[PDB]
Design a protein around this nucleic acid. Structure first.
Ligand SMILES: [Zn+2]
Lengths: 88, 24, 82, 101, 65, 149
RNA sequence: GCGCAAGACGGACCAGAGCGAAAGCAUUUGCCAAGAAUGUUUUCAUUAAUCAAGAACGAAAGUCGGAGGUUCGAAGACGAUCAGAUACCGUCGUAGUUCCGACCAUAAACGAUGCCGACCGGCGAUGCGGCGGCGUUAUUCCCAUGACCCGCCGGGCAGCUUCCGGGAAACCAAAGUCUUUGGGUUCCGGGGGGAGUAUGGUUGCAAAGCUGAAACUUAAAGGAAUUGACGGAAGGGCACCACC
RNA sequence: GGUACUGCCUGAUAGGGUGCUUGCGAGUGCCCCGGGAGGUCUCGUAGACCAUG
């Protein structure tokens, strides 16, 4: 934003995950869950926050797949939304 | 081939529909 | 296999078979007698109970309805009748 | 004469599936039929690993991996030899090939 | 080839036995249910038995995938 | 299986063999009858009543207790619906579908389902004209449908 | 690299998984009405199965009006390849692809297998609801509830297996219960061509749709499987009359 | 009192994640302190993918 005479003042803009990590997470036998919120902070800054989550395979699990029913997914989604909204 | 002689048949039929008009 | 008494099934198996496919049609549900701890009153309740049942004076909610069975509120005792 | 019991596609109990674009071809094929091959490899390949490993500013820097989902129309696969035809009885076996030693 | 007497020599080699049978043990461990099936046969009084604790988790199966 | 649907299934009630009113039940036939009477005076259909009594008062089948099924008892005392309650229900449902289908015309599926419902109505009503529970000039009409319910 | 705009499209997750009468149907959130399965000691008391006439929906393309035009793109125009390419390849690019409102009613609309019902071998899987059951977890004890885990029951999509029996065979737990021939019903085929053409009728703005012959012609046309021979298919294999 | 172990992170020596030793697969070891010496830990090993007749 401001230049100090060979000093550059930098303010936060954005954040993201490395493509590699993103792909590394996604797999074929699990439900993926996503949500987002638009929140104004206390200083007025307006942020779109994205959230990604996954059904985890249980430790003794025999069944090949871990899938969440739609209502469960909606629930989790709602709670993510709630949480990060409250945080920011 | 079938599709094409069906098509050709519709061409011919349109042409016959032209050559014989209800005016004749 | 090739030998079975369709006449004398073992009671266990008959507990296993679907209610209509039994040698005689036997309802799988029973009338139960519910008692809330804080009161004396006894209440007759159907095993799988739709709606919601109440103890009159205490306004006690006995049970919530669910898909299969009504589920009683905690601490409330019950006895199958006969 | 019916060739496959499943008709080459995974479609059961549903009427129509979303069509997808071939990786190699651009030839339209339904997702069920499409031969899918997932590819997990390293961005830089075999020798340039040991090569670049030395030119790093970081210590114990692990090379990123490239992940690519591939769809091939039935033709292209048999061309690239990703899939090859087999005997009448041996066809019946849907157990994937032993890349696991 | 089957040579002869080599069926008799195998009758020699194959014939063997340790001083006591491996079937002889002062304590054999058995599951509660085995003891039940024995109790049906009125053998629930056998001396050599030791009832061993049943394993609490049930996993007998391979994790399909 | 189902008349208007593809599915074929088993979900139902199996009445026990003994028609004999069990021991613990403490209510008379008359008692039950009064209970039913006031419950009908609260605006309930025979099914509703049956359910209430089955749940709270431990009546397995009213029919075993009083010797008469519910609708006959009610119709005997003079309080009965003008049209049998199921026919009523179907009419009301069709009412709803109509009402929703006027705002959204692009809905194909609902139109389809409406037509199905109307068929069920016509079957039933035919059956009731033949059993003389309706005057046989009776006609279900799209316009006065909102009235009857 | 920073921003802006427009219209399309919802990747991966996505499966021999789900939902729908079938076409078909995947971003979030709410609103609106449906629906199967399940549960039920609720209610009506035969109201039911299949369907000429008649009606509802019906992919894509296509046609009329309107809006909109990013991508792709028939027509067209070039550039190439080619003996020749008005074709496969490539650059450009109209109608159309998109939304709204009226038509059209046809697909290899395919499980190439009408619908209702009864019976007939197993076996693991899965989806949905229910029932029961040690034990783990959501931190340490009590009940709920959820996640795994072990079964049972009823619907579903499927799978594997088998001298159930079929079948011309491929194959099929239905295509089984067929000369030991009869559970109910609708549609429908009669060698191949001629031809789904001619005509009349009928629907449509149009393209067409539905109904639909004959004269003549012809010993086969066809279906499964079997050995061959071939392939510009995939594999191996050999030879200094193949090479290194 | 007897008797075991003990990488890091979270939330217990439990539960849940995640590691290093040789590229891989085994072994082995990795809480704290003091002191002591002995040192290129051992055994295996495909890890190979850029027209006309
Ligand atoms: Zn291709």
């Amino acid at each position: 934003e401001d230049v100090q005479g060979k000093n550059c003042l930098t303010n936060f803009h954005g954040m993201d995950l490395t493509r590699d990590k993103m792909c590394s997470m996604v797999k074929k036998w699990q439900t993926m869950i996503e949500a987002h919120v638009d929140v104004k902070t206390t200083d007025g800054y307006l942020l779109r926050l994205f959230c990604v989550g996954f059904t985890k395979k249980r430790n003794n699990q025999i069944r090949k797949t871990s899938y969440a029913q739609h209502q469960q997914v909606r629930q989790i989604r709602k709670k993510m939304m709630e949480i990060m909204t409250r945080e920011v | 081939r079938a599709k094409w002689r069906k098509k050709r048949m519709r061409r011919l039929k349109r042409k016959r529909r032209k050559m014989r008009q209800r005016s004749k | 296999p090739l030998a079975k008494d369709l006449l004398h099934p073992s009671p266990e198996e008959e507990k296993r078979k679907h209610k209509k496919k039994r040698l005689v049609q036997s309802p799988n549900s029973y009338f139960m007698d519910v008692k809330c701890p804080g009161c004396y009153k006894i209440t007759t309740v159907f095993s799988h109970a739709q709606t919601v049942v109440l103890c009159v004076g205490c306004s006690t909610v006995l049970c919530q309805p669910t898909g299969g069975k009504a589920r009683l509120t905690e601490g409330c005792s019950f006895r199958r009748k006969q | 004469t019916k060739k496959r019991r499943n008709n080459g596609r995974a479609k059961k109990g549903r009427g129509h599936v979303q069509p997808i674009r071939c990786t190699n071809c651009a030839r339209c094929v339904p997702k069920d039929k499409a031969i899918k091959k997932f590819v997990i490899r390293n961005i830089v390949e075999a020798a340039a690993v040991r090569d670049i490993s030395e030119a790093s500013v970081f210590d114990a820097y692990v090379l990123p991996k490239l992940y690519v989902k591939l769809h091939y129309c039935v033709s292209c696969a048999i061309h690239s030899k990703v899939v090859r035809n087999r005997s009448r009885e041996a066809r019946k076996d849907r157990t994937p090939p032993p890349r696991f030693r | 080839i089957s040579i002869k007497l080599q069926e008799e020599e195998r009758e020699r080699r194959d014939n063997y036995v340790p001083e006591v049978s491996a079937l002889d043990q002062e304590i054999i461990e058995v599951d509660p249910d085995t003891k039940e099936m024995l109790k049906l046969l009125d053998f629930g009084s056998l001396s050599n038995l030791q009832v061993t604790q049943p394993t609490v988790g049930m996993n007998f199966k391979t994790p399909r995938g | 299986g189902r008349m208007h649907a593809p599915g074929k299934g088993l979900s139902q009630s199996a009445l026990p063999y003994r028609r004999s009113v069990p021991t613990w039940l403490k209510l008379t036939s008359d008692d039950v009858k009064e209970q039913i009477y006031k419950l009908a005076k609260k605006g309930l259909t025979p099914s509703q009543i049956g359910v209430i009594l089955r749940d709270s008062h431990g009546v397995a089948q009213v029919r075993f207790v009083t010797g008469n099924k519910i609708l006959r008892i009610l119709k005997s005392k003079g309080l009965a619906p003008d049209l049998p309650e199921d026919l009523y229900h179907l009419i009301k449902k069709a009412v709803a579908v109509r009402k929703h289908l006027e705002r959204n015309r692009k809905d194909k599926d609902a139109k389809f389902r409406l037509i199905l419902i109307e068929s069920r109505i016509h079957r039933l009503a035919r059956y009731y004209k033949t059993k003389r529970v309706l005057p046989p000039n009776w006609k279900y009409e799209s316009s006065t449908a909102s009235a009857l319910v």
